Amino acid sequence: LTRNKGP
Amino acid sequence: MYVKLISSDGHEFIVKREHALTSGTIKAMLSGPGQFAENETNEVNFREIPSHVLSKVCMYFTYKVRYTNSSTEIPEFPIAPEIALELLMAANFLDC
Amino acid sequence: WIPETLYNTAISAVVDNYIRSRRDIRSLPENIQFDVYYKLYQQGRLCQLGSEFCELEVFAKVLRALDKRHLLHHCFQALMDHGVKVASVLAYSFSRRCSYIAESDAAVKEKAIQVGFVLGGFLSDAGWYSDAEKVFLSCLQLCTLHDEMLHWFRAVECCVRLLHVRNGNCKYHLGEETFKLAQTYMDKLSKHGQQANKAALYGELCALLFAKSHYDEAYKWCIEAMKEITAGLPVKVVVDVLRQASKACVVKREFKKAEQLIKHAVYLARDHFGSKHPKYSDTLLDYGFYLLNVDNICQSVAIYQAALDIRQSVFGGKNIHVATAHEDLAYSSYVHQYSSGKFDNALFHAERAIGIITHILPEDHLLLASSKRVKALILEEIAIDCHNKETEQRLLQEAHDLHLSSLQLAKKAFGEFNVQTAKHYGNLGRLYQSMRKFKEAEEMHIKAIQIKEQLLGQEDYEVALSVGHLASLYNYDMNQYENAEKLYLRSIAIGKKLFGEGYSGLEYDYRGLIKLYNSIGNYEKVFEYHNVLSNWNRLRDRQYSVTDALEDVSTSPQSTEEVVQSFLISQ
Amino acid sequence: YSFSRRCSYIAESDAAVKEKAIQVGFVLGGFLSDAGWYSDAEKVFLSCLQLCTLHDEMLHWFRAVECCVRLLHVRNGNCKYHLGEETFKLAQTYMDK
Amino acid sequence: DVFLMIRRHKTTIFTDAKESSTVFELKRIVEGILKRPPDEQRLYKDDQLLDDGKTLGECGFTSQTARPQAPATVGLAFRADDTFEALCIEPFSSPPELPDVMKPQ
Amino acid sequence: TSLKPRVVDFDETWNKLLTTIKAVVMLEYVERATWNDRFSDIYALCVAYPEPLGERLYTETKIFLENHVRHLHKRVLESEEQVLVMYHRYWEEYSKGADYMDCLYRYLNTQFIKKNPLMEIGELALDMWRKLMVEPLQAILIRMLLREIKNDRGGEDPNQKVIHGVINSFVHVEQYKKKFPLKFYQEIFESPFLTETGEYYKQEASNLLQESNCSQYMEKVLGRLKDEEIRCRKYLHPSSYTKVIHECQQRMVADHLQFLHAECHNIIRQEKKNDMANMYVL
């Protein structure tokens, strides 16, 4: 878990 | 206490009034000017319903009144295939 | 044990003696006919029910039973799951009927249009937009051969309904021409001293321009649509315009107005149509879109699932309307459980969406782009949670194939310069970061920033999300901290401006800055970012207060013209 | 369902129509038992047994026990073992008669 | 309980009676409906007079052949002081001739 | 003939229905056999071929009701100073006729109205008796309906049947709306009635103290309150029973309680047990 949710 | 469900053919079907109010339409036809018939039993003319199918309607009345809220298993109403279509339109018109 | 009605008993008997009276059932009253055909459905006689529903004369009398329409939409669906192409046969039969009565008086031509309008509206409600388009094209032809006032109103209404079936089928190139033709007919109406209402047409144009990611012009056109709503409009038209205006306000970053717009739309649908209507499910779907874009995420899953359960009860499986609810609930459940990581219910709804859309739509259709994206996003996040390298490199490969398919569809339809293809680029950048591919992820993310910055502004939600993804790529993966710091600050500032300090996407930026400053220096920044992250967690403890949005809308919030006027006076 | 409904209407008919219905019911229920539709073959054989146990004639016990040796078959395959013992008892009752 | 259709010419009394009840109670029902004396009423069970002494169960009416679904008919005749009258039950009607669909034609 | 969809004309059958529905709503005498025949005519119109003439039947029925209640409104405008008794005489007939007409239109109610903005025929007639009979006579009817109850308090004998029927008629129109089944009663008559009773129990109630002392007043407080209780049973809907009594005692006790409690010091010391029960029931 290093980035945010996908667009 | 009895009503006289006269069919189109002329066969009067003297059935109990409590049986006749199973159908909403007969209850409506027995309300208002339809209840003003003083001659005891009320005559309900059915010039669109033939006699052979109104007889099955009255049998259904005596069937549903006797088999209402029954504790045991209930049998289906015996309806002939050759009368099923005519008794389908008779069941819609009578709302029973 | 209660006796069955003599009506139901005779329905059972007429069905059982079916073929000997199958041509006599068509002589029955309309409600009796619907009950006979519904009894054929209930007994499992889908073959004879399909053989009768493929006939336009039989099905037109079935469509007259409005109160039992919710049954018909179900029955129809079973036939379309039975393998019998009822919608295609009905549309072809209506086209043949129109071709036969092309030369006839207007008293029988108007009758077929009204039969065509109800059948086309049924197929559009059922979701057979490719089959509802033929019916409406035939109706538009009937309005096109002659030129008069009544035919002009029918042509305007038919172009309004034809725009809707060209929007859900994702044919926008024909949709713009449909709107131009509708505008031509309304100009011809206006030159004869008569004005027709433009609320429904401009609402469908707002849907068209929202689908084409032209959010600014869609917002302008939903303002134009809402400028012309009166008390004489049908409830369905007002609901549709309110939904489209709310969605355009959401993507225009005007979250305040969209609140009252979508809440009044949901209340209007729940009041007039009820809690088990497909239009109310559409309102719930748009309300979930609102709640997902507001960062009221945990509530939104409870609204998509409410939307899905209505669309799964009114419509059976293998339908585009239940598939859109599946793909939207799959995304929100992926969004809601992104931090938790339990993508079990999310993947099930994603595979149900593609498993439907691949069955009822062609492989090159755009609804696969919005469905393959969600499944690939769930698959990518699942595989980084499991420790099997041979399974991770398979799930990321499958997600790579799905992202490439979605990108191909988006680039074929919208072109390379569009918001949809750019968020596909950003999703590919995230996937390439997960694939341990560095330069390719950087190129994808830079292209996503370039396309999402000019077409959405410098301070939009989507561009902030892509800036956060690029910052995580530079920080956790590539070690390019000099740019990653600025990108993280930009993403935090934009998220603070649009959403505030309770934005759920700020955690992945705060921890990124914490790690970056841990491995570059300035520990006094690390301590205060730990303090800010603790404050953010404490604020999210109160912002996490779960309610029911069906109670947030409550009962009788405002008036119909009150919400429209409040939206209009604020530009 | 069609067999049961069309077959309950000839309970008071003559012996020829009743035995024709019993033969048709044996053929259809045997087909549905061979095809594996034991839940849909029990109803056929139940209607057959109903029409066999109406008249007090000699061949009716033979047809009734021939119904019951097939109800017990379509109840074992349907895993309705609690009706199986009572079906055996009723078949043994007609064998006693 | 037993269910009957007391038919005379075209009237059809859809009444009910107990299986242990006698013919006198049924004639009293017809008193209560057609206001006729029981002495002017001869009831026929398929061309067979019912004596007033016996019960409905003995003469043939049971709770199995006279169910509420399909009540068993019984005749009725009136005296008119002249040697009574014969049974003149008029059949209801003929349902439309619905032929067998598999008949070769 | 049979109960099958047949091609029927609307003019002849609708004239045949028009005669009997004119008979019903005015409570005239229509033949029972004709009454049963018109059920079959309603069925034949509702499932007619090739299009169901149910919407047309509803439209012409509403047009007939438009021509009917408007005619009754004009007629009751003609009888000036007799508007209350004429309104009640027409209202009893219209209520029973609308009930019987709902009975006659049962097939249109169940198969068209409750399946397709559309109101049931017996409740369309009641809503139309609202919007074309009592809404044009809203302030007019209350002008002397509130006078007769005021006259009854002044020592008169208004008609029990006429007064109770008109006041209950506002509730009877609200029979079908399940949302607010007493809104019309509580916004057309009850709110004007409550203020008018308050004025009669403020101006006249203050006149009791002008010439009578407290001991005489307490007997007279129970005199008017129980007389209000008797007339509540007569001219008032039972849902409004409690709130009028609370309002009446509010405007002649709760605005004079400072005199009662000041006098309450005297009744305690003297032990006036005769008026002790007066303070107990209030």
PDB file of N, CA, C and O in Angstrom, chain F residues 60-82:
ATOM      1  N   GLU F  60     -65.216  11.313 -19.804  1.00  0.00           N
ATOM      2  CA  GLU F  60     -66.604  11.749 -19.909  1.00  0.00           C
ATOM      3  C   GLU F  60     -67.323  11.685 -18.568  1.00  0.00           C
ATOM      4  O   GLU F  60     -68.227  12.487 -18.318  1.00  0.00           O
ATOM      5  N   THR F  61     -66.928  10.765 -17.685  1.00  0.00           N
ATOM      6  CA  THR F  61     -67.478  10.750 -16.334  1.00  0.00           C
ATOM      7  C   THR F  61     -67.075  12.000 -15.558  1.00  0.00           C
ATOM      8  O   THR F  61     -67.907  12.613 -14.875  1.00  0.00           O
ATOM      9  N   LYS F  62     -65.806  12.402 -15.666  1.00  0.00           N
ATOM     10  CA  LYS F  62     -65.354  13.623 -15.006  1.00  0.00           C
ATOM     11  C   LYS F  62     -66.022  14.854 -15.612  1.00  0.00           C
ATOM     12  O   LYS F  62     -66.342  15.809 -14.896  1.00  0.00           O
ATOM     13  N   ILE F  63     -66.267  14.837 -16.924  1.00  0.00           N
ATOM     14  CA  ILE F  63     -66.993  15.929 -17.570  1.00  0.00           C
ATOM     15  C   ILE F  63     -68.432  15.994 -17.064  1.00  0.00           C
ATOM     16  O   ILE F  63     -68.972  17.084 -16.822  1.00  0.00           O
ATOM     17  N   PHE F  64     -69.077  14.836 -16.893  1.00  0.00           N
ATOM     18  CA  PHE F  64     -70.425  14.814 -16.332  1.00  0.00           C
ATOM     19  C   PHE F  64     -70.437  15.360 -14.912  1.00  0.00           C
ATOM     20  O   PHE F  64     -71.347  16.104 -14.533  1.00  0.00           O
ATOM     21  N   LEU F  65     -69.446  14.980 -14.104  1.00  0.00           N
ATOM     22  CA  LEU F  65     -69.370  15.510 -12.746  1.00  0.00           C
ATOM     23  C   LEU F  65     -69.126  17.014 -12.758  1.00  0.00           C
ATOM     24  O   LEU F  65     -69.637  17.739 -11.896  1.00  0.00           O
ATOM     25  N   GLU F  66     -68.354  17.500 -13.737  1.00  0.00           N
ATOM     26  CA  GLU F  66     -68.177  18.939 -13.919  1.00  0.00           C
ATOM     27  C   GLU F  66     -69.504  19.621 -14.211  1.00  0.00           C
ATOM     28  O   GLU F  66     -69.799  20.684 -13.656  1.00  0.00           O
ATOM     29  N   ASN F  67     -70.315  19.025 -15.080  1.00  0.00           N
ATOM     30  CA  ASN F  67     -71.622  19.600 -15.373  1.00  0.00           C
ATOM     31  C   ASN F  67     -72.607  19.426 -14.224  1.00  0.00           C
ATOM     32  O   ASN F  67     -73.623  20.128 -14.185  1.00  0.00           O
ATOM     33  N   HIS F  68     -72.334  18.513 -13.291  1.00  0.00           N
ATOM     34  CA  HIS F  68     -73.269  18.240 -12.202  1.00  0.00           C
ATOM     35  C   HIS F  68     -73.019  19.114 -10.974  1.00  0.00           C
ATOM     36  O   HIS F  68     -73.926  19.821 -10.520  1.00  0.00           O
ATOM     37  N   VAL F  69     -71.807  19.059 -10.409  1.00  0.00           N
ATOM     38  CA  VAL F  69     -71.569  19.798  -9.168  1.00  0.00           C
ATOM     39  C   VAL F  69     -71.595  21.298  -9.421  1.00  0.00           C
ATOM     40  O   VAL F  69     -71.962  22.074  -8.534  1.00  0.00           O
ATOM     41  N   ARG F  70     -71.226  21.734 -10.626  1.00  0.00           N
ATOM     42  CA  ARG F  70     -71.335  23.147 -10.969  1.00  0.00           C
ATOM     43  C   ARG F  70     -72.794  23.582 -11.039  1.00  0.00           C
ATOM     44  O   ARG F  70     -73.140  24.690 -10.610  1.00  0.00           O
ATOM     45  N   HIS F  71     -73.663  22.718 -11.574  1.00  0.00           N
ATOM     46  CA  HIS F  71     -75.093  23.012 -11.590  1.00  0.00           C
ATOM     47  C   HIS F  71     -75.656  23.086 -10.177  1.00  0.00           C
ATOM     48  O   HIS F  71     -76.455  23.978  -9.867  1.00  0.00           O
ATOM     49  N   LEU F  72     -75.251  22.158  -9.306  1.00  0.00           N
ATOM     50  CA  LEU F  72     -75.670  22.233  -7.906  1.00  0.00           C
ATOM     51  C   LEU F  72     -75.131  23.481  -7.216  1.00  0.00           C
ATOM     52  O   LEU F  72     -75.820  24.064  -6.372  1.00  0.00           O
ATOM     53  N   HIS F  73     -73.913  23.908  -7.559  1.00  0.00           N
ATOM     54  CA  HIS F  73     -73.354  25.123  -6.974  1.00  0.00           C
ATOM     55  C   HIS F  73     -74.140  26.353  -7.409  1.00  0.00           C
ATOM     56  O   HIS F  73     -74.453  27.220  -6.585  1.00  0.00           O
ATOM     57  N   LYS F  74     -74.492  26.428  -8.694  1.00  0.00           N
ATOM     58  CA  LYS F  74     -75.340  27.517  -9.167  1.00  0.00           C
ATOM     59  C   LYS F  74     -76.700  27.492  -8.481  1.00  0.00           C
ATOM     60  O   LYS F  74     -77.206  28.537  -8.049  1.00  0.00           O
ATOM     61  N   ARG F  75     -77.290  26.300  -8.345  1.00  0.00           N
ATOM     62  CA  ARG F  75     -78.610  26.179  -7.732  1.00  0.00           C
ATOM     63  C   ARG F  75     -78.590  26.602  -6.268  1.00  0.00           C
ATOM     64  O   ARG F  75     -79.512  27.280  -5.800  1.00  0.00           O
ATOM     65  N   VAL F  76     -77.546  26.223  -5.530  1.00  0.00           N
ATOM     66  CA  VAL F  76     -77.476  26.619  -4.129  1.00  0.00           C
ATOM     67  C   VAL F  76     -77.094  28.092  -3.991  1.00  0.00           C
ATOM     68  O   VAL F  76     -77.402  28.711  -2.965  1.00  0.00           O
ATOM     69  N   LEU F  77     -76.451  28.685  -5.007  1.00  0.00           N
ATOM     70  CA  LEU F  77     -76.311  30.141  -5.020  1.00  0.00           C
ATOM     71  C   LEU F  77     -77.646  30.837  -5.251  1.00  0.00           C
ATOM     72  O   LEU F  77     -77.851  31.946  -4.743  1.00  0.00           O
ATOM     73  N   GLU F  78     -78.547  30.227  -6.030  1.00  0.00           N
ATOM     74  CA  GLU F  78     -79.855  30.843  -6.260  1.00  0.00           C
ATOM     75  C   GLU F  78     -80.649  30.976  -4.966  1.00  0.00           C
ATOM     76  O   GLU F  78     -81.313  31.995  -4.739  1.00  0.00           O
ATOM     77  N   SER F  79     -80.596  29.960  -4.104  1.00  0.00           N
ATOM     78  CA  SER F  79     -81.344  29.976  -2.847  1.00  0.00           C
ATOM     79  C   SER F  79     -80.527  30.724  -1.796  1.00  0.00           C
ATOM     80  O   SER F  79     -79.819  30.140  -0.970  1.00  0.00           O
ATOM     81  N   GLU F  80     -80.629  32.051  -1.836  1.00  0.00           N
ATOM     82  CA  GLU F  80     -79.963  32.881  -0.842  1.00  0.00           C
ATOM     83  C   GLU F  80     -80.658  32.750   0.508  1.00  0.00           C
ATOM     84  O   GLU F  80     -81.874  32.552   0.576  1.00  0.00           O
ATOM     85  N   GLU F  81     -79.851  32.794   1.579  1.00  0.00           N
ATOM     86  CA  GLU F  81     -80.253  32.705   2.987  1.00  0.00           C
ATOM     87  C   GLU F  81     -80.687  31.277   3.332  1.00  0.00           C
ATOM     88  O   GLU F  81     -80.892  30.938   4.504  1.00  0.00           O
ATOM     89  N   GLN F  82     -80.771  30.411   2.322  1.00  0.00           N
ATOM     90  CA  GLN F  82     -81.069  28.998   2.498  1.00  0.00           C
ATOM     91  C   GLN F  82     -79.917  28.119   2.030  1.00  0.00           C
ATOM     92  O   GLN F  82     -80.123  26.942   1.716  1.00  0.00           O
TER      93      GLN F  82
END
